[PDB]
């Protein structure tokens, strides 16, 4: 199942911060939404894990 | 805080310098808290180990007090996690050679040095199942009478190899001793003498 | 105020009327920055009516004089204290200006407050003006103008808006 390759794919697809307002995949250590559709808000949440 | 605490640390270091004129320089870059407590509680009846940050560069100020001989030779020697060991007893050259005790060596990701780890054909002796780590790595195992044995003789970790999480957990469950390391003496300083321990002391 | 053009510094002394209840008024003294002496006298009445029990009818102004600069040929550093009234609520402020004279520095203070903070001459109340020396300036702009042997060129210096003919074969270069 290659857990190291699963960790790499989760690094490139899963561990992100999703904003509650602009709905943008940004960065794991993000602060604000880089998109100007919301106003660079800090209302973030980690992407949901199982 | 961090002002009265630093002044109290200054009082402790001037008390240890005025009490114990004999010292040993050690390095403990790869050490654990339980290991340090074992070393302290095995050496309660003798020398006392002290560590710290750039406040340990204090013999310069102790010489700026102008109450010393030329003892500042150890000022370019405190580089790369250098700690003092203050003493009064020895006068005895068997310290740390009869006291370099074997310590766990618990399996943790990060250690590469110095040797290899080999697992011969030996039963595990563990409960059900303890086979998932062997399935994640790949080891020819056969289930005998209840303790599951290993058919082949494989090498897990070579020299300079990074330790993985599943490898560390299976080594912790098999209790085969991983890489061990204790505090290493680096420079001997006894009453203003410049020792060159490559190889002169002991 | 209007703060039209450059400003001027006026020393204005003023006292109460000599009354039989209390003769010899204390004859107070202020340092008013104003475009001319009439605005200086009126702003003096404004500040002294803020401070003490004084008004234009029951008092008088003894003297109102121009205050010339003690050293106009010296590039000096002035700290200005501000009591400006913003849109929500009023605020105190400390600003620094490197300029020749005090009236010019307070002029730049009015122009800069009107530029950045949209403050009119109605809202700005100059609390105090004090020359400060080097190694006391809180501001990084004046701190980086504090350079001996200072060097900078003038990149992209375009000028002469239609002083040249409007229709030429030239293609003007900069620097």
């Amino acid at each position: 199942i290659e857990p190291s390759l699963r960790q790499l794919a989760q690094k490139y697809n899963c561990d992100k911060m999703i904003c509650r307002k602009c709905y943008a995949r940004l960065h794991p250590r993000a602060v604000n939404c880089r998109k100007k559709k919301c106003g660079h808000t800090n209302n973030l949440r980690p992407k949901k894990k199982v | 805080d961090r002002a009265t605490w630093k002044s109290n640390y200054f009082l402790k270091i001037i008390q240890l310098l005025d009490d114990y004129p004999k010292c040993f320089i050690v390095g403990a870059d790869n050490v654990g808290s339980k290991q340090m407590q074992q070393i302290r509680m095995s050496l309660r009846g003798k020398a006392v180990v002290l560590m710290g940050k750039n406040t340990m560069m204090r013999k310069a100020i102790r010489g700026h007090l102008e109450n010393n001989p030329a003892l500042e030779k150890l000022l370019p020697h405190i580089r790369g996690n250098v700690g003092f060991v203050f003493t009064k007893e020895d006068l005895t050259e068997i310290r740390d050679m009869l006291r370099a005790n074997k310590v766990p060596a618990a399996a943790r990701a990060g250690a590469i040095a110095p040797c290899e780890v080999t697992v011969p054909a030996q039963n595990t002796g563990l409960g059900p199942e303890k086979t998932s780590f062997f399935q994640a790595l790949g080891i020819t195992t056969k289930i005998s009478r209840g303790t599951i044995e290993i058919l082949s003789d494989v090498q897990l970790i070579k020299t300079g190899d990074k330790v993985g999480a599943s490898e560390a957990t299976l080594l912790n469950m098999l209790n085969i001793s991983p890489f061990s390391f204790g505090l290493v003496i680096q420079q001997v300083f006894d009453n203003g003498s410049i020792y060159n321990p490559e190889v002169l002391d002991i | 105020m209007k703060a039209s053009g450059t400003l001027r510094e006026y020393k204005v002394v003023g006292r109460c009327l000599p009354t039989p209840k209390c003769h010899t008024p204390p004859l107070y003294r202020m340092r008013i920055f104003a475009p001319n002496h009439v605005v200086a006298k009126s702003r003096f009445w404004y500040f002294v009516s803020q401070l003490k029990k004084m008004k234009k009818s029951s008092g008088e102004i003894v003297y109102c004089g121009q205050v010339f600069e003690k050293s106009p040929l010296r590039v000096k550093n002035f700290g200005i204290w501000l009591r400006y009234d913003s849109r929500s609520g009023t605020h105190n402020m400390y600003r620094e200006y490197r300029d020749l004279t005090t009236a010019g520095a307070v002029t730049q203070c009015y122009r800069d407050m009107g530029a950045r903070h949209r403050a009119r001459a109605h809202s700005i109340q100059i609390m105090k003006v004090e020359e400060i020396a080097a190694s006391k300036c809180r501001r990084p702009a004046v701190k980086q103008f504090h350079d001996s042997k200072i060097k900078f060129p003038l990149p992209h210096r375009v000028l002469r808006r239609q002083h040249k003919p409007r229709f030429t074969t030239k293609r003007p270069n900069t620097f």
């Binding site: 790499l8 989760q10 | - | 980086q144 350079d147």
Partner: protein, 191 residues
């Protein structure tokens, strides 16, 4: 706050040579040559040293965003120097699902052809950049090596590969499949 000059310092080794006819930087070394244009930025690029090769990136008054911009020139000059001395090598392991991915090259390493693609029958073709070559690694399962000189070209080719391998119309937390960038490094190692 109209800050007076900001200058960035670049040391240039003796293996390579730099030449500027303006804001155009031309760096020629052992592994080919590489030239770029800094026309839209207007920051002075001076050099000094008789066979000492000290570059300076100097900007006068400017603004805060332009003082942010003046370090970007120094960093791209460092990237060009590393690309002309050592080169760039991106190693991409094919993290594959139940269906494996068959990656071949067609036009001498400039056309990556992708097959079997999570069971999708559509054979995928990705044309790379002029100046980057592709290879399938040896002594390692499904590793894809991209070698080149310019970091922007090599990483844009790797971005085209990792975006051409993309799970669509699904929960992409599940089906962790695609050619992702595993290792970033140089061609000539130990330097």
């Amino acid at each position: 706050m109209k800050t007076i000059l900001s200058n960035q310092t670049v040391d240039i080794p003796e293996n390579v040579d730099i030449t500027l006819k303006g804001r155009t930087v031309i760096v020629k070394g052992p592994r080919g040559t590489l030239r770029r244009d800094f026309n839209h930025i207007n920051v002075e690029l001076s050099l000094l040293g008789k066979k000492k090769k000290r570059l300076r990136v100097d900007k006068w008054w400017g603004n805060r965003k332009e003082l942010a911009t003046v370090r970007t020139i120094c960093s791209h000059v460092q990237n060009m120097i590393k690309g002309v001395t050592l080169g760039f090598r991106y190693k991409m392991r094919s993290v594959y699902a139940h269906f494996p991915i068959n990656v071949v090259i067609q036009e001498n390493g400039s056309l990556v052809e992708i097959r079997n693609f999570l069971g999708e029958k559509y054979i995928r073709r990705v044309r790379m950049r002029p100046g980057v070559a592709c290879s399938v690694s040896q002594a390692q399962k499904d590793e894809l090596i991209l070698e080149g000189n310019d970091i922007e070209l090599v990483s844009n080719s790797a971005a085209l590969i990792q975006q051409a391998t993309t799970v669509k119309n699904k929960d992409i937390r599940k089906f962790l499949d695609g050619i992702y960038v595993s290792e970033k490094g140089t061609v000539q190692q130990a330097d």
